[PDB]
Design a protein around this motif. Structure first.
Motif, short mmCIF file in Angstrom:
data_model
loop_
_atom_site.label_atom_id
_atom_site.label_comp_id
_atom_site.label_asym_id
_atom_site.label_seq_id
_atom_site.Cartn_x
_atom_site.Cartn_y
_atom_site.Cartn_z
N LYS A 130 -5.46 2.11 -3.96
CA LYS A 130 -5.16 0.69 -3.80
C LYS A 130 -6.11 0.03 -2.82
O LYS A 130 -6.57 -1.09 -3.04
CB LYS A 130 -3.71 0.51 -3.35
CG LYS A 130 -2.68 0.76 -4.44
CD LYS A 130 -2.84 -0.21 -5.60
CE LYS A 130 -2.60 -1.64 -5.17
NZ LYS A 130 -2.73 -2.59 -6.31
N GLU A 131 -6.42 0.72 -1.72
CA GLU A 131 -7.39 0.26 -0.73
C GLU A 131 -8.64 1.10 -0.89
O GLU A 131 -8.61 2.32 -0.68
CB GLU A 131 -6.82 0.35 0.68
CG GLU A 131 -5.61 -0.53 0.94
CD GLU A 131 -5.96 -2.00 0.99
OE1 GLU A 131 -7.14 -2.33 1.20
OE2 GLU A 131 -5.04 -2.84 0.83
N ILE A 132 -9.76 0.46 -1.25
CA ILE A 132 -11.02 1.17 -1.45
C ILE A 132 -11.67 1.60 -0.15
O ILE A 132 -12.69 2.30 -0.18
CB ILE A 132 -12.02 0.32 -2.26
CG1 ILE A 132 -12.26 -1.02 -1.55
CG2 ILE A 132 -11.50 0.09 -3.67
CD1 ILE A 132 -13.23 -1.92 -2.28
N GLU A 133 -11.12 1.19 1.00
CA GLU A 133 -11.68 1.60 2.28
C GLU A 133 -11.52 3.10 2.49
O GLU A 133 -12.40 3.75 3.08
CB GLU A 133 -11.02 0.82 3.42
CG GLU A 133 -11.35 -0.67 3.44
CD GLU A 133 -10.58 -1.46 2.40
OE1 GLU A 133 -9.65 -0.89 1.78
OE2 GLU A 133 -10.89 -2.65 2.21
N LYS A 134 -10.42 3.67 2.02
CA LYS A 134 -10.15 5.10 2.16
C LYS A 134 -10.70 5.92 1.00
O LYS A 134 -10.50 7.13 0.96
CB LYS A 134 -8.65 5.34 2.30
CG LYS A 134 -8.01 4.63 3.48
CD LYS A 134 -6.51 4.88 3.53
CE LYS A 134 -5.86 4.15 4.69
NZ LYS A 134 -4.39 4.37 4.74
#
Length: 866
Positions: A130-134
């Motif tokens: 869901k979060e591309i940062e991780k």
């Protein structure tokens, strides 16, 4: 960096010298050429032997590593007791259709207990995050690990995943979006992984994943010759304990293409260096997880204000309908006025908190298992006036009824106690109340309602004994819940004895009980407020000094506390103790009282039950004598000059006489006790010299040690004397002509025993240390003393080396001692007395013996040709 590079360069240079059989280096640090400057022949010999043992250690390490690299990893992990778990979450190959959340922890199959907490990561419905940062910068470190955790027979990592979305993964009806449904648990064995035998960060081991049944396409479609099926669908009706045990015991799982790629890497140390030296694995945004366990390296300033509340199991009856009620723990943080606080619940370590947290949902299970661990962080002052409620809301299939229905039953837990304590750690059950909805909403009302097992049972006992203003309500149901509390905070107090120490003014009647129970309190809860406990004990023994049993029990309790402090687990807090001594220790007349108490202790050492107490007191004499010295100097500086100095010196002399009597009484029952008393006696006398007369202390110790019989435990007393000469002899201005004859007499007694085979090392150490203090450049005049030494310390070493001409023992120590002795003295002393020996025939015998020992020393020297 310069020091470490110099050390490794010198080590490799010496390794090259040894392997080619050439000349090695000296003076391992700061120059490596500073040894042959006539600095110290004894220190030169010590450098020789430490270099030799390092050579042996490095060559055996090379021999071991030439074949296997298993010892190096174990040694590296045993150097320190602070580890970290690094997860290389590359991808999660799967496809479900709802938001995915990760929850990993540490579980011990053999102990059947969880170790670490869980951290959540947002994941999409079709194998994406869901979060591309991780997606690429997923760096996580799970701290609070030690050797005792790695020594576990089976170390495994438990990973359970809970979905987020609709109730059912199909059509037919609409379900509320934003609710959790557990999916399955995946566990991999990390026994050999945490040993660091092979470092492969690129390798991503696929872990088979086991979940609950979700398909009914092959199991039930084909059944012939006996169709009789009357059952339901098990969606979330699997108890966690049995399923976890089965998954761990299982060796392979038919995941059918479900799982994730992760690799576990162990980085020793803490965040101080892993964020600088291990930046490639641990970045600035790396999440940090704190295990719910007491630390091993208990360093000062170990800040942790985490309150852990764990949900395990809870009874939920079917009720009016055959389907048990849908229960979600809609919990929130409230203060003394019942006001909701923001960002106080942290289900995952390293992720932002949430004002309100809900629990997982089970498919109408009579006795579901949760294993749900969450963390609560509140201010240290605010937590003393906060309350937590557990509202259970019924959830329906349709969204309208799911959101319209409110909490059918409301539970709550108190964070404080009326007496001052906090919620004790351990297994605690909960009782949920239903029916009325207004009495559980007004904050001021339910502050004193039963919400925890201990307070509920004490309230019902009070009602049974006195049914006034406290009656058991009939709103309770046939259901129950259970919670696990393990608060790893720094301001909690899970001990009535702790508050009794803190507030003994309120409950001074139970001072005896508190002092009796102080002997089994856990070390961590003690050292949490050790300073406050010590101050309370000091006040108790100061203002209440009329009852002798009170003083005796306080002395025993402080001896136990200081023995716990002196343990191997609390060396880091010893500087804290000393700093508190310097800054907050306000004892003025406690020193004389403590001295009299310990004088009575030693004078009444005849009790058998007193043996271990006296042994602990003798072991911990150092710190209590530091306390006494601080109190005495505080009294002196507050009163300017003390006429009680003379009487306290007399008390110290009487203590020494009592020690003499303790040595004079038979050793048959106090062998180890008196050995330790000899061992730790000179620990504080170095600091006592700063305030007591050095000449008097020296002569008293000389009398004490000459009173020691010379027939039992020679090596122990030799070690004690080795510590004695090491301390305060460098301050030789008043302890040369009184201490040197004592050393000469003890070595003369050591000389002729025919059993000095192990005493050789002790004699060598004594000779080395006395020569060191003789040749120290901060000493001054040593002419007549060295003259007397060479008068009576040369024939005996000649005789000893003649006796030990055998080449097996450690002759080199004696050789270094004798060469230092011979070189230190100049021709003046030789002409004065060495030439002025006894009659001519005897001096001829001396000369021929010296020639014989010289030709034996040179003849077949037994060095290591290095």
């Amino acid at each position: 960096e310069l020091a470490e590079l110099k050390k490794k360069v010198t080590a490799k240079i010496d390794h090259g010298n040894r392997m080619l059989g050439l000349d090695l280096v000296v003076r391992d640090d700061n120059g490596n050429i500073l040894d042959p400057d006539e600095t110290s022949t004894i220190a030169l010999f010590k450098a020789h032997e430490v270099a030799s043992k390092r050579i042996e250690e490095k060559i055996q390490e090379e021999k071991s590593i030439l074949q296997n690299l298993d010892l190096r990893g174990q040694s590296i992990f045993s150097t320190i007791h602070t580890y970290g778990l690094y997860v290389n979450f590359k991808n999660f190959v799967c496809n479900i259709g709802e938001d995915a959340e990760l929850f990993m922890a540490l579980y011990d199959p053999d102990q059947s207990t969880f170790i670490s907490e869980n951290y959540l990561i947002r994941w999409g419905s079709n194998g994406m995050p869901k979060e591309i940062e991780k997606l690429n910068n997923l760096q996580a470190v799970f701290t609070d690990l030690s050797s005792m955790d790695l020594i576990r027979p089976r170390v495994s990592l438990v990973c359970q995943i809970v979905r987020v979305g609709h109730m059912e993964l199909k059509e037919g009806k609409k379900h509320t979006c934003g609710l959790r449904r557990p999916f399955g648990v995946a566990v991999m064995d990390i026994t050999d992984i945490i040993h660091g035998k092979v470092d492969d960060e690129e390798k991503q081991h696929f872990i088979p994943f086991q979940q609950i049944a979700m398909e009914t396409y092959i199991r039930q479609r084909q059944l012939i010759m006996s169709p009789l099926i009357t059952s339901h669908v098990i969606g979330e009706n699997e108890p966690l304990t049995s399923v976890l045990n089965k998954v761990i015991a299982a060796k392979e799982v038919n995941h059918k293409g479900q799982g994730l790629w992760v690799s576990l890497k162990l980085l020793p140390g803490d965040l101080t260096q892993v964020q600088k030296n291990f930046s490639h694995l641990v970045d600035r945004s790396t999440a940090i997880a704190r295990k719910m366990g007491f630390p091993e390296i208990i360093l000062p300033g170990d800040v942790r204000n985490d309150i852990y509340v764990t949900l395990i199991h809870g009874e939920f009856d079917k009720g009016k309908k055959k389907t048990p009620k849908n229960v979600e723990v809609t919990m929130s943080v409230h203060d003394e006025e019942g006001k909701l606080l923001e960002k106080a619940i942290h289900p995952g370590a390293g992720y932002e908190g949430i004002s309100e947290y809900k629990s997982v949902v089970y498919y109408q299970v009579k006795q579901p298992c949760w294993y749900e661990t969450v963390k609560v962080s509140i201010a240290i002052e605010e937590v003393t006036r906060c309350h937590i409620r557990f509202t259970f809301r019924h959830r329906s299939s349709q969204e309208t009824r799911d959101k319209s229905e409110r909490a059918f039953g409301v539970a709550f837990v108190k964070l404080m106690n009326p007496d001052g304590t906090t919620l004790q750690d351990g297994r605690h059950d909960l009782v949920v109340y239903k029916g009325d909805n207004k009495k559980m909403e007004d904050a001021k009302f339910y502050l004193t309602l039963p919400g925890t097992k201990m307070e509920m049972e004490e309230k019902e006992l009070q009602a049974s004994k006195n049914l006034v203003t406290f009656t058991p309500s009939k709103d309770s149901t046939k259901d129950s819940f259970q919670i696990a509390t393990l608060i790893c905070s720094t301001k909690l107090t899970q001990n009535v004895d702790l508050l009794g120490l803190l507030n003994w003014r309120s409950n001074s009647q139970n001072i005896k009980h508190n002092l009796k129970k102080l002997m089994e309190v856990d070390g961590g809860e003690i050292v949490k407020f050790l300073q406050d406990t010590l101050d309370a004990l000091f006040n108790i023994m100061m203002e209440m000094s009329d009852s002798e049993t009170y003083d005796f029990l306080v002395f025993d309790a402080l001896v136990f506390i200081i023995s716990l402090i002196g343990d191997i687990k609390f060396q880091h807090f010893n500087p804290v103790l000393e700093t508190y001594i310097y800054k907050h220790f306000s004892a003025t007349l406690a020193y004389v009282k403590l001295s009299k108490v310990l004088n009575f202790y030693v004078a009444n050492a005849d009790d058998s039950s007193k043996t271990e107490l006296l042994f602990a007191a003798l072991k911990a004499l150092k710190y209590l004598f530091r306390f006494i010295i601080q109190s005495r100097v505080l009294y002196l500086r507050f009163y300017g000059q003390s006429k009680d100095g003379d009487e306290f010196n007399n008390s110290i002399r009487q203590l020494f006489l009592a020690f003499n009597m303790l040595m004079d009484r038979p050793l048959e029952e106090a062998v180890k006790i008196k050995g330790a008393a000899l061992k730790y006696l000179p620990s504080i006398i170095n600091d006592v010299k700063l305030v007591f007369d050095p000449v008097e202390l020296s002569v008293l110790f000389c009398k004490f040690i000459q009173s020691i019989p010379d027939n039992q435990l020679v090596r122990q007393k030799l070690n004690c004397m080795t510590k004695i000469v090491e301390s305060t002899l460098f301050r030789q201005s008043e302890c040369r002509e009184v201490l040197l004859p004592l050393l000469t007499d003890q070595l003369s007694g050591q000389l002729d025993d025919n059993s000095n085979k192990p005493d050789h090392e002790a004699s060598s150490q004594l000779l080395s240390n006395i020569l060191e203090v003789l040749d120290r450049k901060d000493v001054g005049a040593t002419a007549v003393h060295i003259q007397l030494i060479m008068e009576r310390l040369l024939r005996r070493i000649n005789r000893t080396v003649i006796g030990m001409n055998r080449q097996s023992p450690h002759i080199g120590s004696f050789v270094a001692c004798m060469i230092a002795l011979l070189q230190q003295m100049d021709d003046s002393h030789y002409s004065h007395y060495i030439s002025t020996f006894k009659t001519r025939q005897d001096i001829i015998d001396f000369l021929m013996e010296t020639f014989i020992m010289f030709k034996d020393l040179i003849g077949k020297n037994v060095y290591a040709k290095d």
